Subunit: 464 residues, 3 copies
């Protein structure tokens, strides 16, 4: 009898699981919302510099209207390589955010110290890719300690995010990095194996910069790594050691698929289901970004903030429905929970996009300001040409947005807290009377090329 | 000089041949119609229970409008595995019929006894897949003996089917099976190697149930199987022993392709030809099933019935053209030749589908009742949401329909012989006056969940 | 740590490079236009006979409207095999022209003699494929010596072509070939290793026919070939010896991709970019062919003719824009530079195609007749059903046109020099008054089945 080769079957459930971390794929938690889980781990936050400027340049005539295609190609060529190293080193990519990503090594507390060495070795290999071969740099922040996960949503949509000091720290660490630095959180530094890791300290900072690894005499990284894999639940092994992810072996299971699909946008499921040409989700399109930020008294306290995020989510999704927008991503962004919402994504191109974005934003502002435990709401609104597309590796990728206007909306919400703000394109393009707005003082902002005048959306009735 | 790897070329002719058995692919018979051929073989009829109920459940809201996609995925995951075992054990899948399939081992008469052992071993391995790991069972019927093939059609369309006592028997055998039984026809039992095959007998039945194989002391199944492959014309071997089918090696040949394509529906050829997205042939769509049954004096006598089927076919295809329907499948269904016809398939969505289905059915009834050697015509008409899609394995698959309404239309034609019947959806939804119909006595029917009231389509003029 | 398999990544840049020779892919020359480069090499011009007759036959009813699909399948099955042998023997396919192709072995002058032996061995292996197994023959012409390349175009489009005596010779040689001959140019014969190559001479010709290779006693072709690969810049080797082309390894590089894409038509880039179903570029469509020929005093003198071709190109592309046509291919066609232009390609289906083709042709005629160094302009216009599609191998293929009308337009331009001519379909179908034309004397033409009456497009005003 023959034993013929079994071709890989790229079932729908496998295509879905490319868009999710192992944390969700193999999580099996309750469908109650909010749901909270607690664990320890090491986080790596990898941030590429230079793609929003490249994004702007790929709209230029030299690209002959293949800018989106060229952009995604050159982005994924680079990001794929970084995704592979994370996976090969045993990490779980949690989420892509534009030209950045967040990765997790979830381990028992006794194993943190050793796992930190693994993650540093990985981060230095990723740093390496950028010291070779046009205009892009990488900042890496590392953190370790207690992590909480929140799952929130409704009967058709699910979102997760991670919370706690390690989460805050990893972003803090990454923000300090000079171009091409690997920075460890103070807690990471405290738990790491200091006899191996040569650091230099950082100005007015307890966080530290990694110079190099200095293995002891008998040290063998492959044997060490192998010991560490004992603690790695899903590391591909044995018959599957040739795969980047165990998720590549998932088999059809309608219950699991129903649960996983709730995390993925409808337009992406259409493509997975071969109901739309692939070409069409990579685009440079004019959209409006609505970047919502919710601040709490204590943003590390999941059982306090979880209900409030769920509450906020329920209202947000309902008004976005009305005003025709979508939630692209939710994540903790030092100080708060941020929702990155988009008007004008595939299918939801309306006229009066701008007006709607503003009225939606005001509605969210009003409602969220009264949700218990939400200290402060801030919302930034910006409009322009943004890259929208699937970023990552074939085995692990997500739909995301990259552009100067995304950055602008995020920086507005931080530099102008407690109000709804908008850019000049949104202001000028809105249907709305000029006295619905206030012209704002100009602020020098980080990592935003130029704002042009900014405004507060004061809203329809007077407040003085 | 290099000897570079030769990538598999999935030519159109290879994609076409996935939809056909070796019986047709390598058959090369006359293009005259009808054409009849005679041989011996073993038949296996594998019938999955539980997918029409799953079909009904996958229309529910929990599936979030990805019911068709989820259904086909979970169906093919299972059916693919069964198709592989048949192929690996040397069989030819002849035809898929919903959630069932029919397979053939064509051999010289002296080899039947040994081949029956092979097919039993296969059937017990398939039975096995169902004793592991939600709500599906498998009934397997086996038959052996003389088989005739009929090829019928016109200058652009071809159909085949198998005929004779073994064909009748394999369906009889399968219908007796308690859930998960393997049943042998009486003739199969008579020809098999009884010293190996432990059976228990069956109530008021000469057919028998297989308990297990009980190989003699020296018996080695792999050596036995290898001996049997001497008699297997197309068993992949040598350089091609890593392939499931020799048909995977077919090379472009416009004459052969012209001949093979006549068996495949136009919408499928469009997809093969990359002129339509794959996603679109898997659907849960509202259709009307017209299940036509033709009974003859002797349904095992190919040279008698062949002309009549050809005649019936010519008229059927012509009125289906007019009323916008299609022949999905033709097969012998104890007592007669059945045509499973569909109104509302991809492209042929009209309004007045229902009326048309009824007028078409009456026309076919009238014409076929006068074709010489057609003893009785019965036609069942039912309307509802049915799964329409490609079922099977990548190397061997066919477009088919699965649903409670398909079953209903088949059961109507059998329980209400000699008339055209319809369900309540068809009745209520038709354009037609109430006195064109007669309300029928309710019959308890097998493997149909509930009919609702049924009617006879009496037709336009009175008969009393 | 795992070392998982790296799946082949079919990046856009790799898909683009399938449409271009190594000459361009790895060329990196100036973006100035015209650009001229000079080298030596051996040329092989492989011409299949019988596909324009097959093209005509595949429009017939027997093909059941899958003629385009069947045609391209059977063409590529054959042409792929020829492309593979060229690549494996170290050649660079420069260009496809319908059912023919031109291949180049670019080498230092001292290596011509040995390389000629390699190319003959290849040509005899290709001749071989046609002596096996319906109605197609192959004529092969070989030439060797000095070659110039011209790159011409504008800021969004690039074209190249090869020029010089070897180029003229290879087409001359191929035109003499009796069906299935391999003919060497006189210069090729003069440089080859005559102690190995047994020829018979040719009627009123210095060119020669290859009978066979007659290796000396110690000769080992594999060792010889290996020596020759020292001189082959891009021969796949080492880790990549399993690939047909080094171009299969190209990595994303936006500068390179911007440069390469300028050679490829927009409709093809759309398909590369997964913005259109593949099925749609293979078609049998009614088009109008405008075959422009420019003759110069000396057509081997690149620095003379290069400016004139660039000048002609600039005007041609501008009027084709206006009249909605496209340049399909440009090449030297003994005596001159020919532009094969098409009206009615994917997307550019207009009514008044015919009129436009004629007015465009007259405009080009008028303008090019005054470009300095253009001795004579001739333009042939023919309309009918032509095959339009991607021809070649997966790793090396191009969009091209095949049909009796393409041949007709080429033969008109040669047999009726110095005027614009058209066929009867174009004449009768044009919007234009009869006295805009002159009915021409009928000429017996080579390799054109029947012309029907031909006309000169005299144009709008009288000349007498
Ligand atoms: N798709 C996305 N998801 C979440 N946050 C985003 C985002 N795009 C931009 N941001 C936010 O925009 C802000 C500007 O970010 P920085 O990270 O300082 C830009 P950078 O990394 O140096 O170069 P870049 O603009 O080429 O990315 C950050 O607060 C970042 O979190
Ligand atoms: N696509 C299809 N082709 C041919 N016959 C079909 C069909 N779908 C249903 N039928 C017929 O419908 C009838 C009801 O069949 P059964 O085989 O008793 C149902 P079952 O196998 O127990 O479970 P199921 O309804 O989940 O399939 C049978 O006569 C069967 O042949
Ligand atoms: N796509 C294309 N590109 C360039 N030239 C073309 C062409 N199609 C046809 N021609 C030209 O048409 C003319 C007729 O060519 P021949 O090469 O004698 C036909 P053949 O090769 O014997 O058989 P065929 O018509 O089946 O191809 C030649 O001058 C050829 O260069
Ligand atoms: Ca960034
Ligand atoms: Ca069934
Ligand atoms: Ca030719
Ligand atoms: Cl997160
Ligand atoms: Cl999210
Ligand atoms: Cl059958
Ligand atoms: Cl059939
Ligand atoms: Cl050329
Ligand atoms: Cl060209």
């Amino acid at each position: 009898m023959n034993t013929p080769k079994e071709e890989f079957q790229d079932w729908p459930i496998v295509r879905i699981a490319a868009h999710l971390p192992d944390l969700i794929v193999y999580g099996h938690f309750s469908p109650e919302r909010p749901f909270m889980d607690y664990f320890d781990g090491v986080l790596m936050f990898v941030d590429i510099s230079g793609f929003t400027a490249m994004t702007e340049k790929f709209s230029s005539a030299m690209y002959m209207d293949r800018g989106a295609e060229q952009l995604v190609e050159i982005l994924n060529y680079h990001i794929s390589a970084i995704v592979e190293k994370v996976l090969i080193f045993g990490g779980d990519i949690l989420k892509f955010a534009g030209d950045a990503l967040l990765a997790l090594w979830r381990v028992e507390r006794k194993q943190l110290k050793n796992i930190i060495t693994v993650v540093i070795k990985c981060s230095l290999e990723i740093h390496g890719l950028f010291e070779t071969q046009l205009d892009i740099r990488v900042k890496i922040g590392l953190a370790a300690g207690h992590i909480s996960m929140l799952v929130f949503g409704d009967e058709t949509h699910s979102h997760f995010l991670v919370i706690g000091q390690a989460v805050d720290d990893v972003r803090l660490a990454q923000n300090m990095a000079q171009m091409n630095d690997v920075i460890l959180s103070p807690n990471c530094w405290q738990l790491c194996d200091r006899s191996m890791i040569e650091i230099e300290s950082v100005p007015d900072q307890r966080a530290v910069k990694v110079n190099f690894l200095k293995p002891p005499p008998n040290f063998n990284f492959d044997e060490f790594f192998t010991k560490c894999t004992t603690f790695m639940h899903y590391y591909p092994s044995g018959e599957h050691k040739n795969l980047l992810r165990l998720a590549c072996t998932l088999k059809p299971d309608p219950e699991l698929e129903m649960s996983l699909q709730k995390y993925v946008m409808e337009s992406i499921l259409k493509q997975i289901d071969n109901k739309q040409l692939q070409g069409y989700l990579s685009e440079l399109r004019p959209v409006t970004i609505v970047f919502v930020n919710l601040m709490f008294e204590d943003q590390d306290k999941a059982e306090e903030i979880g209900p409030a995020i769920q509450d906020a989510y329920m209202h947000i999704t309902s008004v976005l429905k009305i005003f025709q927008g979508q939630i692209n991503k939710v994540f903790m962004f030092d100080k708060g929970c941020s929702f990155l919402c988009v008007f004008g994504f595939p299918g939801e191109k309306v006229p009066d996009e701008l007006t709607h974005a503003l009225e939606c934003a005001m509605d969210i502002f009003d409602f969220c300001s009264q949700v218990h435990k939400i200290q402060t709401v801030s919302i930034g609104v910006a409009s322009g040409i943004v890259f929208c597309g699937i970023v990552g590796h074939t085995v692990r990728h997500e739909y995301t947005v990259i552009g100067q206007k995304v950055n602008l909306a995020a920086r507005m919400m931080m530099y102008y807290p407690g109000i709804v703000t908008c850019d000049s394109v949104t202001y000028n393009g809105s249907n709305l009377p000029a006295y619905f707005f206030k012209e704002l003082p100009k602020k020098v902002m980080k990592g935003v090329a130029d704002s042009g005048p900014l405004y507060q959306y004061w809203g329809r009735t007077e407040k003085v």
